[PDB]
Symmetry: C5
Subunit: 377 residues, 5 copies
């Protein structure tokens, strides 16, 4: 009875094209915020951020005011899209094909004229994804909201702190915070200034997932490659092991490619580690060729270098604590074999040490390594 009358009376002469201000010269103050419900996807390959966001817009409509005493029990009213004025706040740095992922819901208006509009939306936003420190990366993704057509002279956008109470954790990204900033920017379209509210979601990738799927396995497979230098040369599988492991390590980097944006702004940390790892094992094959070349050096062929004869069978042999014509061929060849064995032991120490130092050096360079090991392991 009374609610029918109110709906009939609130829409008499009401024009949804009119900014609902009593004085036209004063700007309308609209309080903007958002509730970040979930970070569903951070598409690093496309540099996109898909998030479930409930925007919160509250303002004061001068025309939708009534006595609750004269309309008993009617304390709130609801209006749909297109029957009431609404602020045309839009996400400037959108990546969504329709550019407006917001789902239009009712606006709730109470008797003092205060209108409240909370449209849910799967907002897809264009974010610069800094992949320098991946996986140990902290992203600062900006969500920039502002009126598309109303400037500061008309629509006085005002911040309110973002809600995280209803946030459901992701599992891959650990929300560090969502600080917001209100600025009054000038654009080359227009002379009227435009205010905006930018929320910088600061997300810390939890590293257990890719710590284990990508980095730990690479290290153990690179260790499998180091076994090459203990394999006896006469086995015949010295290099097979080296080349087969190498293709296993390539499938790890093809998988990084599946997610890495096509940018050239910087070299991701993991790429540096895999690049250094691959070259180290690639160099393992090279020294493998040389030790085999030494192992098989024709007996009758040109005698051994004196330098070699000291640098491997006198000094390096002692450091590591190792110690008829056909017979001399076997004796000369056996010395070639002994040099080969010493080079095998030498390069194991050196490539193992180079692997260890390289591994920690590249990994420990990340300012998030200490943090990530502390929280995520």
């Amino acid at each position: 009875e009374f609610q029918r009358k109110l709906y009939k009376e609130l829409v008499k002469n009401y024009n949804p094209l009119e900014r609902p201000v009593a004085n036209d010269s004063q700007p309308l103050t609209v309080y903007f915020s958002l509730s970040l419900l979930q970070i569903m996807d951070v598409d690093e390959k496309n540099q996109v951020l898909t998030t479930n966001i409930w925007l919160q817009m509250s303002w004061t409509d001068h025309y939708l005011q009534w006595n609750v005493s004269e309309y008993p029990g009617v304390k709130t009213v609801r209006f749909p899209d297109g029957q009431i004025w609404k602020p045309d706040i839009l996400l400037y740095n959108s990546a969504d094909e329709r550019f407006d992922a917001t789902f239009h819901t009712n606006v709730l208006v109470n008797s003092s004229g205060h209108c409240q509009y909370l449209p849910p939306g799967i907002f897809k936003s264009s974010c610069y994804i800094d992949v320098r420190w991946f996986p140990f990366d902290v992203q600062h993704c900006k969500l920039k909201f502002g009126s598309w057509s109303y400037g500061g002279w008309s629509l006085d956008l005002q911040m309110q702190e973002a809600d995280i109470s209803g946030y459901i954790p992701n599992g891959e990204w650990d929300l560090v915070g969502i600080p917001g900033k209100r600025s009054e920017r000038f654009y080359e379209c227009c002379k009227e200034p435009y205010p905006d509210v930018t929320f910088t979601v600061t997300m810390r990738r939890r590293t257990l997932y890719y710590g284990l799927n990508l980095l730990i396995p690479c290290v153990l497979i690179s260790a499998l490659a180091l076994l090459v230098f203990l394999l006896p040369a006469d086995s015949g599988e010295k290099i097979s092991l080296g080349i087969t492991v190498l293709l296993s390590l390539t499938v790890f980097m093809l998988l990084v490619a599946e997610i890495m944006p096509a940018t050239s702004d910087s070299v991701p940390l993991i790429a540096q580690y895999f690049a250094s790892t691959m070259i180290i094992v690639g160099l393992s094959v090279v020294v493998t060729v040389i030790v085999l070349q030494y192992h098989h050096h024709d007996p009758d062929g040109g005698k051994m270098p004196k330098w070699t004869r000291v640098i491997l069978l006198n000094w390096c042999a002692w450091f590591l604590r190792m110690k008829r014509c056909q017979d001399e061929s076997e004796a000369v060849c056996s010395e070639w074999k002994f040099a080969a064995c010493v080079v095998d032991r030498l390069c194991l120490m050196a490539f193992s040490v180079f692997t260890i130092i390289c591994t920690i050096g590249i990994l420990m360079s990340a300012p998030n390594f200490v943090e990530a090991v502390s929280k995520d392991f």
Copy 2:
């Protein structure tokens, strides 16, 4: 004749914005339920659940009442979207790009003003998937339905038990149940409390596909890896087999990885078992390299250590001219390589059987999964 008059009479002064109550201070009782016709997909990667559902919403419109005696033969009427008041009951935890996958069908009203609205939909809901027990995992996915802008003071949402009569089994997911719970939450936006209807779909994965397509094949590939310790050393291909099988076992992790999300909440059981299997194969390859070093040992190198000469050639063995004399030392080494192979075959077999069983029987749902599915 009468149907035309009824339709013309029911839309006089009707306001689809008005809540169709007689007393404005009392709320409107809306009975909510759903019929889960199917569970179409469970995208563990995007953490989404695609289900075919018919929402059921039944209430009373005070204004769409007619006395049937005067309208003979017109027992019901039908109204489309935007001509009748409807409760804006949305899925809060929606993961659909439009956020409302519901299809707006008609509202059927009988003469007592009772309205019935059953929109079909393919709902995408944002589910936390607990992947710790994968594949022997049970999921509790919530579908939380509520009026977006009507609090309890206006719309008294009341749950009715879910229907599964027409449910079409999925083949991967055995509907364990769809227990529901109502509630009256409070939001930071607003002071008026808001009620909601949460159905916690309880789904048990059916473990035959993933049992036979990944877990069992992985066991047999690890067995092919174990085969190394039965190969004669002189064959010249111990390492070839060992490494071609270690790299092959990665395949399974690629498929496991393209199905499972990238959360760091926990380590999936499938991941633990595959990691243990690959680590066992890697330790087999390492043992293989020590065996090859023993086998291809230069006779004029070091003398055989006493510890080695008893721990391998005497105890384990019992439990289970210069060229000539050089041949015999190298012979001893070949025997020691054989003893290490046999000892390590036994030990690696025991760990594989233990590890896989120990890991698989760690799942609370393993016994039920095996008995019901295999």
Copy 3:
């Protein structure tokens, strides 16, 4: 001229929300059928069927009638969605994200009030796919159509048979038929019974494509694996061959898993075939490890058992019409060769026997080889 008059007359006091019957008690007979223009996809992984369908709905509208003598030359009118009552006939089992893939077109009414409505559509239906016999399957995919909000007491659905005159061949599926049936079923929601029409599209998979790209190719790589037995053991690559071919067979299995649903209601015939190929090639690897063990036997190890002696190197050799340390090893190398032969014949009969049975156990096999080869 007469069009303007008829179109103005036919819409006076017309309410599209009014089922168009003269008497409100009797039901409205709506004839439903469909034209199946193509089977675009059978997404087996998703258990969905995507089809080109022209639904065919005919009924009679009491109010939309006239005298052609008073509107000469005006023998039909057409109305767009929104201005004429229409049966809300939906596909209940619809997998499309929208739930109504129908494209809304005009309703054509002739002067006796008979309205004809043929909306085209790309219909995705949630179909259960019976994969036990894949690739020799006969999918019975159901398209269940009916009014969403009119019961039998109000809308008397009736079904004419489906059209296939314009049906285009698919190349993967032979339309075995599209029979239909009317079913007046009761729902737990409501007491008024609701009629539905179900068209059971019966599709026979043309097995030449898959047979050529999955089954036949596998047989030959399994034979390639069997060639291990007859390699001389001195070559040095017996297990190399075995392991390579067995990995390739895994390539095949990954493909067939890319195309087979994730269902525990049965095991596809194809899966059982690859599982048994790789099982046999696995046991080829095992017996070849035993063979190498025999070949690389230490002459100073154990003496040959009389069982190993007469079983393998007397009787088994006999049938197949085939210095001391070298002699002892020579006896051992001959053991490897007889195991090589014996295993061939034995594994070969398995190879041939198994497949033929796994394959010929499908009821559709004879038809498949006769029609698709």
Copy 4:
């Protein structure tokens, strides 16, 4: 001033549902054509053709006529969707999820009443793709256009020759033409005939892309397989080479399989060529096994067969101009090695002949192959 008058005057009593004719008994003549702007994609796997088209629909509205003298400077008017009658000319064999991909634009009407409607669209269209001669294939994709609900008695559809002046090439297909055909067809629904206009886009594939990516790499890697025969037997890597080559020659069959539909009407030419190649390579593996059986033959085994002694060591040995107890063993085994060696060289030439013959024959079985090599190479 006058444009407002004319727009206000052309909407008096107008009904967008009326067929705009003076006499209700004579059919309206609609001239239909299309401008094919680009063939954006040919989804062979889905049997779909995605094309950029500007359909051209021209007719005469009896009611939208004025004299430009009374409305000076107003020679044309424009009406958007839902305000003017437009023919419901759809694409019968459409594959788009929404069926009508046309983007609805304005209808331009001049003073004499002639209306012109050129809506752009991305028309997905079910095309039977004959893959028998792929990559050397010519496709005839039909776009069948017609009025959905007007028969020949109401809408007399008429053909205007298609436009390809503004066609920009595709890069994968060479437009042979787009000849049309107007038919008057009867349907099982109804008695009234329906005229339709069918354009048969004829496309010739440009084969250099697949020519260099799928074809020549197969010939090359196959020659690399044939190198197996020239290795000496003692290397101990013949079998590994053959299998490595074959399992990697399977790469191209899983790759081409990524694009072709699952049709069983016929067998693709590329598939026939790959199958022949694989049969030849597998037979090379088989003969490699036989050659190793010859080479690693125990001397004390069976005696050399007489037929073997002659067919290899006497006739073939001359066709290719080839030529104590322990001592006899290598002599017998040396005959076996020459037997193995003559077989290797013989079969090298024989398998080589099969490769060139099979490749040339199979490739030359495509009728337009001569045109292909003359235009794309």
Copy 5:
């Protein structure tokens, strides 16, 4: 209060179908431009360009004018889609399924009647991604905008320079510029010429990514192939390493064919380079078989020719500074064959290395944009 009055007065008799000119015979001047906010994607495979674009259309509506003195504080009004006349400027060469990705926003009209309309949009345009010089490639994508139904007689389209003010860098594409051009062309449909504004965004590819993912790895794994010529023959592993490397060189080229279109207009630089290295490594495999023929050469086989005995063991040997009785003769003869095998290994190492150096460097510098690419990205 006054804004209600103005909105009620501006729509009295207004018709959104009418072009808002006072003189019907004079074309309406529409100033068109755009702001390029991001190059969201360049899909070379599908031949598409996805861009974040804010179009700018400005014109003068004769009917939406008022003096602000009579409407104090109301200096600007805003009309949504379907309430005000708007220019139907579409993107001709669009590849979007709906053909028009523009998001319809309000039109802002100030007190002098000047209307300004800035619809944002994720525009998908059908581009000719020339790919002969990939990865050192410069792409010219044209975005042609123009009224779909109005010619130069009714709507005088006028270009305004484009902007890159808020161009958010992409990381893969260095925007070289967005020069525009206004043309007046005739079409086979009509007798009225239709003006258009074509913006030709020129984008240079930053080659660091695909340079170290494809160009460089190939060089290093091809070096691994070259290692075959250093392997001793006695190891009996030359063929394994050679073939395994040459099979692992196709994985990259499969990703190379996963990004670039299947066009047959030109052969990409990357494809030429990959073919050249693949031919060189395959020739390494062929030579590996030949040297193995030399190495495992039966001593009782064919006698050494006097050409191979001088062309390898005398001249080419001298260049590189290499330096029971029946069995001894047999082993000595085989050792000459083994020596011949070694000389061919060393020669082919040098020859294939030089052919790799030349081929790699020459082909890579054949791109016009190579010096600039290496100078900016390294």
